[PDB]
Amino acid sequence: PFTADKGKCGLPEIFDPPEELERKVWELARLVWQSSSVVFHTGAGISTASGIPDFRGPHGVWTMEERGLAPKFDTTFESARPTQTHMALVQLERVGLLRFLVSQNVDGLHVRSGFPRDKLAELHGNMFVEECAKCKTQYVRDTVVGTMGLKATGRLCTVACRGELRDTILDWEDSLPDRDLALADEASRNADLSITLGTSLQIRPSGNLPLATKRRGGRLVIVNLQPTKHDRHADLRIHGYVDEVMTRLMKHLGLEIPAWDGPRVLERALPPLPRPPTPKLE
């Protein structure tokens, strides 16, 4: 806990200049069109524009802690709106340009975004989701589950059970949930395109999954303001705000970023919605 390694925190940000940024997103555009199976890996950087601080960035939880300062939240978890990036990932799934989404975030926004849970691994859990110890039934709640570290919440299961309900937030010692990690690994290995959004890729095995894609000739794209463990293995690193990259990307793809109607829960994914026809690439 106190001892736990929080890896490299407070590294400098890189800012690709507009010309290099605009061009790198057109190449990302091309790789989404080329790819049969596109998987997105997300981390706390896709939630920073909502007012949720990240961990290892300039004003990250771990970064401000090293310098004896406090992270600053500009919102509560309950009153946080999903980002343009969160809503872009929703459209990309709906139009069939996103096979699987893998997140290290516990902020709960993916789910609150309306994103299909059966196409999502929440690898470090969800602040809003408690799980029945007895029958493994999950409850997506409307306020944050008040505990952390797979502890009893105080509520009991309501299946036609009275099983102990506990949080889904992994403690430093706790192993990842096998179902989520297994689907996340299959998705990552099977993928021909893995795009990482606002993660430093410093945690095992979360951070290593985008590298499973690169095996069998898959392409790896890293969108992050800072360096990242596996920058060396990327075919494309984009250094900029992900909201900018994903707003420009969606515009190249001919896609609108949909409205957020407030917190909604989508258990299962629907058949793909119509999407624009693919440009001639080669």
Ligand X SMILES: Nc1ncnc2c1ncn2[C@@H]1O[C@H](COP(=O)(O)OP(=O)(O)OC[C@H]2O[C@H](O)[C@H](O)[C@@H]2O)[C@@H](O)[C@H]1O
Ligand Y SMILES: O=[N+]([O-])c1ccc(O)c(O)c1
List interacting residues with ligand X (CB under 6 A).
13, 43-45, 48-49, 54-57, 60, 104, 124, 198-200, 202-203, 224-226, 241-242
Q: Which of 83, 87, 80 is closest to 107 using CA atoms?
A: 80
Q: Which stretch binds Zn ion (CB under 5 A): 19-27, 57-65, 125-133, 211-219?
A: 125-133
Q: Is 162 in the site for Zn ion (CB under 5 A)?
A: no
| Spatial separation of the C-alpha atoms in residues 148 and 142, rounded to whole Å | 17
* Interface size with ligand Y, residues (CB under 6 A): 9
Query: Is residue 149 exposed (0-12), middle (13-18) or buried (19+ Cβ within 10 Å)?
Result: middle
Among residues 95 and 140, whose Cβ is nearest to ligand Y? 140
Does 55 belong to an annotated binding site? yes
Q: Please, which residues bridge with residue 122 across strands?
A: 103
Q: Which stretch binds ligand Y (CB under 6 A): 52-60, 186-194, 199-207, 234-242?
A: 52-60
Nearest distance from C-beta of residue 267 to ligand Y, angstroms: 23
The one of ligand X, Zn ion, ligand Y, none whose footprint includes residue 161, by CB under 5 to 8 A per kind, is Zn ion
Nearest distance from C-beta of residue 4 to ligand X, angstroms: 8
DSSP 3-state of 6: coil
Q: Is 103 in the site for ligand Y (CB under 6 A)?
A: no
Catalytic member of 124, 230, 239, 252: 124
| Spatial separation of the C-alpha atoms in residues 58 and 225, rounded to whole Å | 10
**Quick one: tokens of 94?**
């709906």
Among residues 132 and 213, whose Cβ is nearest to ligand X? 213
Does 67 belong to an annotated binding site? no
| Spatial separation of the C-alpha atoms in residues 245 and 235, rounded to whole Å | 16
In the region spanning residues 137 to 156, those forming contacts with Zn ion, defined by CB under 5 A, are 137
**Quick one: tokens of 257?**
């970023």
| Spatial separation of the C-alpha atoms in residues 233 and 214, rounded to whole Å | 8
Q: Specify the residue for token string 């059970």.
A: 161
Ordered alpha helix ranges (H), 35-169: 61-66, 84-94, 109-112
Q: Is 124 a catalytic residue?
A: yes
Binding-site member from 25, 39, 61, 234 for ligand Y (CB under 6 A): 61
| Spatial separation of the C-alpha atoms in residues 85 and 106, rounded to whole Å | 16
Q: Is 45 in the site for ligand Y (CB under 6 A)?
A: no
| Spatial separation of the C-alpha atoms in residues 87 and 142, rounded to whole Å | 19
Q: Both ends of the chain: CA-CA distance in Å?
A: 52
The annotated binding site for Zn(2+) is made up of: 132, 135, 157, 161
The annotated binding site is made up of: 44, 48, 55-56, 62, 104, 124, 132, 135, 157, 161, 198, 200, 224, 226, 242
Active-site residues, by number, are 124
Which residues contact Zn ion by CB under 5 A? 132, 134-135, 137, 157, 159, 161, 163
